[PDB]
Scaffold this active site. Structure first.
Site, PDB file in Angstrom:
ATOM      1  N   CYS B  25       0.770  -1.254   0.000  1.00 26.14           N
ATOM      2  CA  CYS B  25       0.000   0.000   0.000  1.00 26.14           C
ATOM      3  C   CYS B  25       0.802   1.306   0.000  1.00 26.14           C
ATOM      4  CB  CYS B  25      -0.960   0.037   1.196  1.00 26.14           C
ATOM      5  SG  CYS B  25      -2.040  -1.398   1.284  1.00 26.14           S
ATOM      6  N   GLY B  47      14.855  11.308   3.809  1.00 30.91           N
ATOM      7  CA  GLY B  47      15.442  10.345   2.887  1.00 30.91           C
ATOM      8  C   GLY B  47      15.672   8.988   3.523  1.00 30.91           C
ATOM      9  N   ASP B  49      16.461   6.566   7.203  1.00 33.23           N
ATOM     10  CA  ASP B  49      15.574   5.909   8.159  1.00 33.23           C
ATOM     11  C   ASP B  49      15.132   6.812   9.310  1.00 33.23           C
ATOM     12  OD1 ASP B  49      15.602   3.026   7.050  1.00 33.23           O
ATOM     13  OD2 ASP B  49      17.745   3.448   7.247  1.00 33.23           O
ATOM     14  N   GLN B 143      -2.955   8.660  19.090  1.00 32.78           N
ATOM     15  CA  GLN B 143      -4.112   9.186  18.361  1.00 32.78           C
ATOM     16  C   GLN B 143      -4.985   8.023  17.905  1.00 32.78           C
ATOM     17  OE1 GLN B 143      -5.025  12.208  18.060  1.00 32.78           O
ATOM     18  NE2 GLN B 143      -6.711  12.095  16.605  1.00 32.78           N
ATOM     19  N   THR B 144      -6.300   8.170  18.025  1.00 34.59           N
ATOM     20  CA  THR B 144      -7.218   7.071  17.711  1.00 34.59           C
ATOM     21  C   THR B 144      -8.438   7.602  16.952  1.00 34.59           C
ATOM     22  OG1 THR B 144      -6.446   5.894  19.698  1.00 34.59           O
ATOM     23  CG2 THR B 144      -8.477   5.102  18.676  1.00 34.59           C
ATOM     24  N   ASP B 245      17.127  -0.569   6.966  1.00 36.93           N
ATOM     25  CA  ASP B 245      16.242  -1.718   7.195  1.00 36.93           C
ATOM     26  C   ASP B 245      15.338  -2.007   5.997  1.00 36.93           C
ATOM     27  OD1 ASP B 245      14.575   0.463   7.623  1.00 36.93           O
ATOM     28  OD2 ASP B 245      13.392  -0.549   9.185  1.00 36.93           O
TER      29      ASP B 245
HETATM   30  N1  LIG Z   1       4.905  13.087   4.377  1.00 37.79           N
HETATM   31  C1  LIG Z   1       6.257  13.071   4.500  1.00 37.79           C
HETATM   32  N2  LIG Z   1       6.920  14.218   4.763  1.00 37.79           N
HETATM   33  C2  LIG Z   1       8.266  14.258   4.891  1.00 37.79           C
HETATM   34  N3  LIG Z   1       9.062  13.175   4.774  1.00 37.79           N
HETATM   35  C3  LIG Z   1       8.536  11.941   4.523  1.00 37.79           C
HETATM   36  C4  LIG Z   1       7.068  11.823   4.371  1.00 37.79           C
HETATM   37  N4  LIG Z   1       6.827  10.512   4.130  1.00 37.79           N
HETATM   38  C5  LIG Z   1       8.016   9.853   4.118  1.00 37.79           C
HETATM   39  N5  LIG Z   1       9.044  10.700   4.368  1.00 37.79           N
HETATM   40  C6  LIG Z   1      10.487  10.317   4.427  1.00 37.79           C
HETATM   41  O1  LIG Z   1      10.911   9.760   3.176  1.00 37.79           O
HETATM   42  C7  LIG Z   1      11.942   8.770   3.387  1.00 37.79           C
HETATM   43  C8  LIG Z   1      11.537   7.443   2.746  1.00 37.79           C
HETATM   44  O2  LIG Z   1      10.303   6.990   3.316  1.00 37.79           O
HETATM   45  P1  LIG Z   1      10.052   5.472   3.798  1.00 37.79           P
HETATM   46  O3  LIG Z   1      10.202   4.593   2.581  1.00 37.79           O
HETATM   47  O4  LIG Z   1       8.729   5.477   4.518  1.00 37.79           O
HETATM   48  O5  LIG Z   1      11.316   5.116   4.740  1.00 37.79           O
HETATM   49  P2  LIG Z   1      11.435   4.821   6.332  1.00 37.79           P
HETATM   50  O6  LIG Z   1      10.317   3.926   6.725  1.00 37.79           O
HETATM   51  O7  LIG Z   1      12.689   4.001   6.245  1.00 37.79           O
HETATM   52  O8  LIG Z   1      11.588   6.139   6.995  1.00 37.79           O
HETATM   53  C9  LIG Z   1      12.095   8.630   4.895  1.00 37.79           C
HETATM   54  O9  LIG Z   1      13.212   9.421   5.323  1.00 37.79           O
HETATM   55  C10 LIG Z   1      10.806   9.219   5.448  1.00 37.79           C
HETATM   56  O10 LIG Z   1      10.946   9.691   6.796  1.00 37.79           O
HETATM   57  N1  LIG Z   2      -3.575   4.633  20.587  1.00 38.58           N
HETATM   58  C1  LIG Z   2      -3.132   5.406  21.613  1.00 38.58           C
HETATM   59  N2  LIG Z   2      -2.042   5.078  22.344  1.00 38.58           N
HETATM   60  C2  LIG Z   2      -1.588   5.817  23.361  1.00 38.58           C
HETATM   61  N3  LIG Z   2      -2.163   6.964  23.740  1.00 38.58           N
HETATM   62  C3  LIG Z   2      -3.262   7.422  23.089  1.00 38.58           C
HETATM   63  C4  LIG Z   2      -3.821   6.654  21.969  1.00 38.58           C
HETATM   64  N4  LIG Z   2      -4.889   7.343  21.514  1.00 38.58           N
HETATM   65  C5  LIG Z   2      -5.009   8.457  22.288  1.00 38.58           C
HETATM   66  N5  LIG Z   2      -4.029   8.500  23.214  1.00 38.58           N
HETATM   67  C6  LIG Z   2      -3.844   9.534  24.256  1.00 38.58           C
HETATM   68  O1  LIG Z   2      -5.116   9.705  24.888  1.00 38.58           O
HETATM   69  C7  LIG Z   2      -5.364  11.093  25.137  1.00 38.58           C
HETATM   70  C8  LIG Z   2      -6.640  11.525  24.416  1.00 38.58           C
HETATM   71  O2  LIG Z   2      -6.441  11.578  22.992  1.00 38.58           O
HETATM   72  P1  LIG Z   2      -6.778  12.945  22.203  1.00 38.58           P
HETATM   73  O3  LIG Z   2      -8.140  13.466  22.586  1.00 38.58           O
HETATM   74  O4  LIG Z   2      -6.533  12.647  20.749  1.00 38.58           O
HETATM   75  O5  LIG Z   2      -5.662  13.913  22.873  1.00 38.58           O
HETATM   76  P2  LIG Z   2      -5.236  15.367  22.307  1.00 38.58           P
HETATM   77  O6  LIG Z   2      -6.421  15.780  21.461  1.00 38.58           O
HETATM   78  O7  LIG Z   2      -5.035  16.241  23.516  1.00 38.58           O
HETATM   79  O8  LIG Z   2      -4.010  15.107  21.493  1.00 38.58           O
HETATM   80  C9  LIG Z   2      -4.145  11.840  24.638  1.00 38.58           C
HETATM   81  O9  LIG Z   2      -3.323  12.054  25.765  1.00 38.58           O
HETATM   82  C10 LIG Z   2      -3.401  10.887  23.728  1.00 38.58           C
HETATM   83  O10 LIG Z   2      -1.975  11.075  23.841  1.00 38.58           O
HETATM   84 MG   LIG Z   3      13.472   2.357   6.990  1.00 38.80          MG
HETATM   85 MG   LIG Z   4       9.867   2.353   8.371  1.00 37.53          MG
HETATM   86 MG   LIG Z   5      -4.735  16.858  19.689  1.00 38.87          MG
HETATM   87 MG   LIG Z   6      -5.450  13.987  19.491  1.00 45.17          MG
HETATM   88 NA    NA Z   7      11.452   6.518   9.450  1.00 48.21          NA
END
Ligand SMILES: Nc1ncnc2c1ncn2[C@@H]1O[C@H](COP(=O)(O)OP(=O)(O)O)[C@@H](O)[C@H]1O
Ligand SMILES: Nc1ncnc2c1ncn2[C@@H]1O[C@H](COP(=O)(O)OP(=O)(O)O)[C@@H](O)[C@H]1O
Ligand SMILES: [Mg+2]
Ligand SMILES: [Mg+2]
Ligand SMILES: [Mg+2]
Ligand SMILES: [Mg+2]
Ligand code: NA
Ligand SMILES: [Mg+2]
Ligand SMILES: [Mg+2]
Ligand code: NA
Lengths: 342, 353
Positions: B25, B47, B49, B143-144, B245
């Protein structure tokens, strides 16, 4: 944003790539607290950022993550709004500086490749400029295919203890200050739908769009200048949802009472006409990129309000009181609705 | 080792709440690069990791990373463990053995009833939590959100002293390439989903049995829940020069990414490939769907690819295996132009469970 201005069709709407819900897309507050059951000051899950003391320097790592879907049809602004929503959590802690950002993207599997190639670079631009205003930059992230368009990120700061303000020092007699008006969901909702005139609708959307893009960074700083005792930002659970969570965090036996609601003009009348679609008057209507809700002593309060408006400036409101209580929050039986014109 | 019976429809599958593709995906590497174009102590930005960000504080620098994925196994708890292993997998690419904090990224499918939620989502969360504890860290925020699909990811962050990490840029001619886990996870997870599809099973059936697929699946699951942390610590012990990796863009996509980073004018050549038993036959029975022979097959929580001094790679393998899981020397570094290839007729090593 004129779609046809970008060799895109007339019928394209960024908001096509998600669904609209009156009550928002987040998992509800009581369910998350349930599922999240197996899980120098320090702060775990429950509030707006974590604060994790480090091994090095008596420093603390403060960080936070966010993601959302398209709510306005103007791709540049929406990325601004995305970057602002992430950084909001930092500002509720008072941290004016961001050491680093990571960006989350989700590209919709329903959008043409041509739509993706026009719309994404615009979004990525809105995120960058907003980061620049925050004094920071994006240095990594994750980008993947999804049924919907997703936008989000991470903000991270390594702080000395003076940089942050633990969200728990409220005492009876403090007053509640809110720095952005309510009703952002209603405004985005009704605009997509194009009681209220078509003109009433456009001015609202444009105003909500602007306020969502504005950073809570100035507010974070004035919480130091005016000795704030606690704060949260207002997002997906709404004014009452986040108020209730802040309250329960207090060291002292206090309870919160919100007296009036500053709403984007005409949006109260919409939510009202939609029964229980939104619940604007009950306080649970989701916000996006809302302002700060801050517990300030009464003197620091007018002074804080004066300086945010006339520092560039933006109005803030006195909306409620802190009292001796059992750490709960509530809006009064009949709140006053302040109608804030564009 | 999972059954929806206790806890749901006997028909319940977790991998139903996404859509599986032989090519996975991810926004493809190339597309990705041209979307990001806009956006002393050593520094590392977009770029590779992780980022490596010098902070104005006592010679520290910020090292962090994020990731999100969709269900590839029907075991929920094991899906929790794997989604966490993959987030960390990036930290371990920089030789960074400590993780100072984690955040979680969670999506619930709007298609899964309330019973299924309060029974399945706990499982994923505890798995994730169990992985973080193994890694000596914990989850303190996240975040959920509702989504059409079930979504799994997170964030890993460390605040590092200068010799805690290894800049992936110091490869030299004569260095060799070690891989620490076998390839083909995208084939293994797929074929376990194709049991339940009459038109796909009818075809692959000419190539492998039910027990073999049950087997390659169980093996794949354990490898993907396996942390790269030990490998990370040994990068320091045996003077590793550079690592990346193996995840969404395959063994080659990521080998090429790392050959781009090198200071020296050097290139990578890959001569052999360790692959879970039978998976490479399955790949061929499916045309250009996967591309497991050309190095463009997706892996999730794959291994570390490490450039090691020719004199040291051998101690490393001995050490990672004897004290353990096997590793393989899959190629070498030579003078070149910051690229990487697979030889035309690579030797296939059939790793059995
Ligand atoms: N929306 C984004 N904005 C900025 N940098 C990104 C975004 N998505 C991916 N990257 C960066 O692009 C590079 C390649 O991505 P990815 O294949 O997901 O590698 P990785 O999982 O090893 O970080 C990584 O350095 C990643 O952090
Ligand atoms: N999947 C998750 N794992 C760990 N912490 C979570 C997850 N989802 C939400 N939280 C935590 O639960 C609290 C409530 O979530 P949220 O309302 O999204 O917080 P906020 O809006 O202040 O970022 C936040 O402190 C967030 O860090
Ligand atoms: Mg990687
Ligand atoms: Mg990765
Ligand atoms: Mg928030
Ligand atoms: Mg939140
Ligand atoms: Na990464
Ligand atoms: Mg918040
Ligand atoms: Mg990634
Ligand atoms: Na938060």
């Amino acid at each position: 944003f004129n779609p046809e201005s970008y060799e895109l069709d007339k019928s394209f709407r960024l908001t096509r790539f998600t669904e609209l819900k009156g009550t928002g897309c987040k998992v509800p507050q009581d369910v998350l607290q349930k599922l999240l059951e197996s899980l120098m000051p320090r702060l775990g899950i429950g509030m707006d950022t974590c604060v994790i003391p480090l091994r090095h320097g008596g420093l603390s790592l403060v960080q936070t993550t966010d993601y959302i879907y398209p709510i306005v049809d103007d791709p540049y602004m929406m990325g601004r709004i995305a970057c602002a929503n992430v950084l909001s959590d930092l500002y509720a802690m008072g941290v004016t500086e961001c050491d680093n950002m990571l960006m989350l993207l989700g590209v919709s599997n329903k959008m043409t490749d041509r739509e993706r190639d026009k719309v994404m670079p615009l979004i990525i631009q809105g995120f960058k400029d907003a980061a620049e205003e925050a004094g920071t930059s994006v240095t990594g992230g994750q980008t993947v295919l999804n049924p919907w368009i997703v936008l989000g990120g991470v903000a991270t700061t390594v702080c000395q203890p003076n940089e942050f303000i633990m969200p728990d020092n409220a005492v009876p007699g403090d007053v509640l200050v809110l720095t952005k008006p309510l009703g952002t969901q209603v405004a985005v909702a009704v605009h997509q739908w194009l009681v209220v005139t078509q003109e009433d609708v456009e001015l609202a959307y444009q105003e909500a769009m602007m306020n969502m893009a504005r950073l809570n960074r100035t507010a974070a700083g004035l919480m130091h200048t005016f000795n704030a005792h606690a704060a949260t930002d207002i997002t997906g659970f709404g004014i009452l949802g986040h108020a209730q969570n802040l309250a329960k965090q207090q060291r002292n036996e206090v309870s919160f009472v919100i007296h009036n609601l500053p709403v984007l003009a005409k949006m109260a009348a919409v939510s009202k006409a939609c029964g229980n679609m939104f619940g604007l008057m009950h306080g649970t209507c989701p916000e996006t990129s809302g302002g700060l809700l801050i517990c300030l002593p009464r003197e620091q309060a007018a002074r804080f309000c004066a300086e945010i408006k006339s520092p560039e400036g933006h109005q803030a409101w006195i909306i409620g009181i802190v009292e001796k209580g059992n750490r709960t929050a509530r809006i009064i039986d009949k709140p006053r609705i302040i109608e804030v014109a564009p």
